[PDB]
Amino acid sequence: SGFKKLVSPSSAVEKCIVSVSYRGNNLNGLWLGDTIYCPRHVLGKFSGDQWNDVLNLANNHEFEVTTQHGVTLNVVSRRLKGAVLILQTAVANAETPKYKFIKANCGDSFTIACAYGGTVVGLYPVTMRSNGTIRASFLAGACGSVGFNIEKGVVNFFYMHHLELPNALHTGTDLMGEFYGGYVDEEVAQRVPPDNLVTNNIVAWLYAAIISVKESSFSLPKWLESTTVSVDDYNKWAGDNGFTPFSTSTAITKLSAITGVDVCKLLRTIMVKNSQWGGDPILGQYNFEDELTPESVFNQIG
Amino acid sequence: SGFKKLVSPSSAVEKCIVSVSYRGNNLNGLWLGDTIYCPRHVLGKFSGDQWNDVLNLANNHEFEVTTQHGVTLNVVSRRLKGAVLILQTAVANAETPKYKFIKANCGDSFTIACAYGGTVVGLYPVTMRSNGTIRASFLAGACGSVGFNIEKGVVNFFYMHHLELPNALHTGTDLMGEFYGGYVDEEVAQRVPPDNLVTNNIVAWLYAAIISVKESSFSLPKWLESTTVSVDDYNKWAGDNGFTPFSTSTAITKLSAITGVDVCKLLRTIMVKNSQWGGDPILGQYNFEDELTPESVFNQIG
Ligand SMILES: *C(=O)[C@H](C[C@@H]1CCNC1=O)NC(=O)[C@H](CC(C)C)NC(=O)[C@@H](NC(=O)C(F)(F)F)C(C)(C)C
Ligand SMILES: *C(=O)[C@H](C[C@@H]1CCNC1=O)NC(=O)[C@H](CC(C)C)NC(=O)[C@@H](NC(=O)C(F)(F)F)C(C)(C)C
């Protein structure tokens, strides 16, 4: 019993994180096969069409790349792909895991390996927000940190960190070099669209709250609405109230079955609680938790 | 910028987690040098003075110990230390880190390496609560999972998982075999004292919020009380209102000096917001976060 936001174990990723520095700019890279992926602003703070000329003038021998075992790696080629710099090394990483480069969708949760100087210093879970940001924890030096999970023995790489926006919002690229949310790696004002609370994850959390209450009180929570709202009617309301649309999933179907509570009561609960939460907390809170996924809640049922 | 509840990276610990089974009981062990530490109920569900006779009846050849890579280990001796079974292996773990066994005090926070079948499947942070429990996420098979952190290249082990109490509360031993909270490894009703909100960690979270509001709005937070309360006055109030006592620490002093905000203004804020929070959130919430430590907040400013 108990529900937590889980982080993936980090050993396979630690074996791929390296330090990449260039003329005083210190970042991190992801070393897979004979290729290092790292943010292109290791070269400096350029914009637009300046990047290809910067790339052509750069020199491989000035990339200072070190492994966590203190081996120096040697760059033999360089290219840009989107906002990611791709550096080829003279020898391959013999500890390359099975992996895939996947784009995270809104509401998908994954683990950040927060790295400084080529060393992972801590991990934490994040959710890709509707507007292409994550709420993370990064300082100067953390760029190149990656977001990942592990599924069926494969490391999925979702994210490489580039940029901190106002209000402690973070963004970056996938491992293809494409920025989430259409941001850019420039120190200029950038529009950030409103964050929409992730309905499917809130639904998971309400089900976790019901399981908690039932497993140790056999009595449905007082805050749970008995009235229902249809999905299309909730989704109409969601578009006007800053929530993502509800969409069915295998995990949500199972959680509704396991608890015996109609998801349409949970949606009506979202609508009521959002308008006026009142004095009844849900798992101790008076605000919605939307970074715990239905799959994670399911996996924590025994 | 941004604040998260961080998890330690797990590679050093993954190299020490093994599976330990005995006559159908399947749990995990921690393999350091030539010694495996695991919960003594791998031998079965006994009580009181029975454990010594059970230990004497056990036979080393019937322990099934396997490493994550599938290597079978051979037990050559056995002894009890509190509720921990200590098994000696014929060969030492060549991947043993530098480590310490430390007992966590109330408010101390650390990482759970959640393991099934000898394999770490996920990590998450926890805080040692005032009643000697942690609020974790465990299923059958998880016993022997360990709580740890890493400081200055040394793995501190704080916790080994044994038992789930009512209301999804978890507890277990330190690596010396002593149960937290005076619980026992028996499937009986046990006395669980109140879980008091952890003042020192709430103070950390309020400094985090102060830091965030300074960075976002160039002002003190609207919710921050201007009056101070003395520590002695606060601590009398805490004992009547389900809070732990405040106590100074190096990290809290550093946060007070960095922000320029007297910690006694934070203590007054706790008293006021606990009695009537109102509609102003703190870092998005209307309830106290008490599992982010002063040390972690300090580390996330640099
Ligand atoms: C990695 O090099 C850092 C990580 C940042 C530093 C503070 N927290 C982080 O996550 N990235 C940068 O310093 C980045 C460099 C660009 C050239 C891509 N700059 C920023 O993130 C800046 N942000 C912006 O200017 C903004 F997004 F437009 F707001 C700051 C001001 C340095 C945070
Ligand atoms: C590891 O072997 C499990 C971990 C448990 C399983 C469910 N979630 C957990 O964290 N521990 C046990 O099964 C343990 C064995 C004892 C002999 C130490 N038993 C329990 O945790 C039981 N708890 C109790 O009887 C209680 F604490 F008194 F409440 C349950 C009922 C199996 C959870």
Question: In this structure, which amino acid lies at residue A103?
Answer: K
Residues facing residue B63 across a β-bridge: B22
A45 within ligand 1 shell (Cβ under 6 A): yes
Residues 6 or more apart whose CB falls under 8 angstroms from that of B170 comprise A2, B133, B134, B135, B136, B138, B161, B163, B164
Cα B19 from Cα A147, distance rounded (Å):
29
Cα B14 from Cα B67, distance rounded (Å):
10
Strands B154-165 and B99-101: parallel
Cα B263 from Cα B249, distance rounded (Å):
11
Active-site annotation holder among A16, A38, A114, A143: A143
In A, minimum Cα distance to B115 occurs at: A9
Residue A183 alpha carbon, nearest atom of ligand 1:
27
Residues facing residue A144 across a β-bridge: none
Domain boundaries, chain B: 11-182, 199-299
Going by C-alpha positions, the residue among A2, A296, A289 that lies closest to residue B133 is A2
Determine phi and psi for A32, rounding to 5 degrees: -130, 125
Q: Which two tokens stand for residue A301?
A: 């049922």
Determine phi and psi for A119, rounding to 5 degrees: -125, 125
Which class for B218: exposed (0-12), middle (13-18), buried (19 or more C-beta within 10 A)?
Answer: exposed
B11-182, CATH topology level: Thrombin, subunit H (2.40.10)
Residue-by-residue DSSP string for A275-291: H---S--BTTBSS---S
Cα A28 from Cα A19, distance rounded (Å):
5
User: Residues of A with CB below 8 A from B215's CB?
Assistant: 168
User: B157: CA distance to ligand 2 center in Å?
Assistant: 21
Strands A146-151 and A154-165: antiparallel
With tokens 């530098």, the residue in question is B98
Residues 6 or more apart whose CB falls under 8 angstroms from that of B11 comprise A10, A11, A14, A15
Residue whose CA is closest, atom 30 of ligand 1?
A: A164
Cα B121 from Cα B113, distance rounded (Å):
8
For ligand 2, residues with CB inside 6 Å are A 1; B 27, 41, 45, 138-140, 142-143, 162-166, 170, 185, 187-188, 190
Q: State the CATH class of domain A12-89.
A: mainly beta
Residue-by-residue DSSP string for chain B: ------B---HHHHTTEEEEEETTEEEEEEEETTEEEEEGGGG-S--TTHHHHHHHH--GGGEEEE-TT-PEE-EEEEEEETTEEEEEESS--TT---EEE-PPPTT-EEEEEEEETTEEEEEEEEE--TTS-B-----TT-TT-EEEEEETTEEEEEEEEEEEETTTEEEEE-TTSPBGGG--SSSS--------B-HHHHHHHHHHHHHHHHHHHSS--TT--SS---HHHHHHHHHHHTBPPP---HHHHHHHHHHT--HHHHHHHHHHHHH---S--BTTBSS---SS-HHHHHHTT-
A98-182, CATH topology level: Thrombin, subunit H (2.40.10)
Yes or no: say if B106 and B88 are a contact pair by the CB < 8 Å rule. Answer: no
Active-site annotation holder among A16, A38, A41, A161: A41
Q: Which two tokens stand for residue A132?
A: 């292409």
Residue whose CA is closest, atom 19 of ligand 2?
A: B163
Q: Which two tokens stand for residue B120?
A: 């770490």
Question: In this structure, which amino acid lies at residue B256?
Answer: S
Yes or no: say if A44 and A31 are a contact pair by the CB < 8 Å rule. Answer: no
> How would you classify residue A250: left for phi > 0, otherwise alpha for psi between -120 and 50, otherwise beta?
alpha
Q: Which two tokens stand for residue A9?
A: 């174990």
Determine phi and psi for B112, rounding to 5 degrees: -95, 125
Residue among B123, B164, B286 whose CB faces A1 most closely: B164
Which class for A53: exposed (0-12), middle (13-18), buried (19 or more C-beta within 10 A)?
Answer: exposed
Going by C-alpha positions, the residue among B146, B47, B12, B30 that lies closest to residue B85 is B30
User: A195: CA distance to ligand 1 center in Å?
Assistant: 20
Q: Which two tokens stand for residue B297?
A: 């907040």
Determine phi and psi for B214, rounding to 5 degrees: -60, -40
CA distance, residue A255 to nearest chain B CA (Å) = 17
Quickly count: other Cβ atoms within 10 Å of residue B223's Cβ: 17
Cα B152 from Cα B154, distance rounded (Å):
6
Residue A260 CB-half CA count within 13 A: 7
Strands A99-101 and A154-165: parallel
Residues 6 or more apart whose CB falls under 8 angstroms from that of B175 comprise B30, B37, B84, B101, B146, B157, B158, B159, B160
A94 within ligand 1 shell (Cβ under 6 A): no
Yes or no: say if B16 and B93 are a contact pair by the CB < 8 Å rule. Answer: yes
Superfamily of domain B199-299: main proteinase (3clpro) structure, domain 3 (1.10.1840.10)
State CA A150 to chain mean position distance.
13
Compute CA distances A43 → A177, B41, B168, B281, whole Å: 15, 57, 50, 41
Question: In this structure, which amino acid lies at residue B45?
Answer: K
CA distance, residue B286 to nearest chain A CA (Å) = 6
Going by C-alpha positions, the residue among A245, A262, A244 that lies closest to residue A253 is A262
Cα B85 from Cα B143, distance rounded (Å):
12
Residue among A14, A164, A284 whose CB faces B9 most closely: A14
Cα B121 from Cα B114, distance rounded (Å):
6
Q: Which two tokens stand for residue A175?
A: 């491992």
Long-range contacts of B46-54 (CB under 8 A, 24+ apart): B47/B184, B47/B186, B51/B80, B52/B80
Going by C-alpha positions, the residue among B38, B40, B35 that lies closest to residue B115 is B38
User: Residues of A with CB below 8 A from B2's CB?
Assistant: 135-138, 164, 168-170
- CB contact (8 A) between residue A123 and residue B123: yes
With tokens 């943010």, the residue in question is A39
Going by C-alpha positions, the residue among A123, A107, A124, A102 that lies closest to residue A173 is A102
Cα A259 from Cα B118, distance rounded (Å):
31
Yes or no: say if A114 and A122 are a contact pair by the CB < 8 Å rule. Answer: yes
Pocket test for ligand 2, best of B112, B162, B163, B186 (most atoms within 8 A of CB): B163
> How would you classify residue B255: left for phi > 0, otherwise alpha for psi between -120 and 50, otherwise beta?
alpha
Sign of the torsion formed by the C-alpha atoms of A248, A135, A7 and A25: positive
Respond yes or no: is residue A41 known to be catalytic.
yes
Residue B127 CB-half CA count within 13 A: 23
Quickly count: other Cβ atoms within 10 Å of residue A272's Cβ: 16
Yes or no: say if A101 and A83 are a contact pair by the CB < 8 Å rule. Answer: no
Going by C-alpha positions, the residue among B169, B268, B206, B200 that lies closest to residue B3 is B206
Cα A243 from Cα A234, distance rounded (Å):
10
Residue among B4, B137, B287 whose CB faces A300 most closely: B137
Compute CA distances B218 → B1, B160, B222, B259, B300, whole Å: 14, 45, 12, 12, 19
Q: Which two tokens stand for residue A154?
A: 């494969």
Q: Is A165 helix (H, G, I), strand (E, B) or coil?
A: strand
Q: Is A246 helix (H, G, I), strand (E, B) or coil?
A: coil
**Residues 201-260 (B) with a CB less than 8 A from some CB of A:** 212, 215-216
Yes or no: say if A163 and A171 are a contact pair by the CB < 8 Å rule. Answer: yes
Going by C-alpha positions, the residue among B35, B47, B153, B19 that lies closest to residue B99 is B153
- CB contact (8 A) between residue B123 and residue A170: no
Residues in chain A: 302
User: A5: CA distance to ligand 1 center in Å?
Assistant: 27
Yes or no: say if A104 and A177 are a contact pair by the CB < 8 Å rule. Answer: no
Q: Give me the helix-helix angle, B263-275 and B231-241, nearest 10°.
A: 30
Experimental method: X-ray
User: Residues of B with CB below 8 A from A3's CB?
Assistant: 137, 168
Find the DSSP H helices in chain A: 11-14, 50-57, 199-215, 231-241, 250-259, 263-275, 294-299
Residues facing residue B148 across a β-bridge: B111, B157
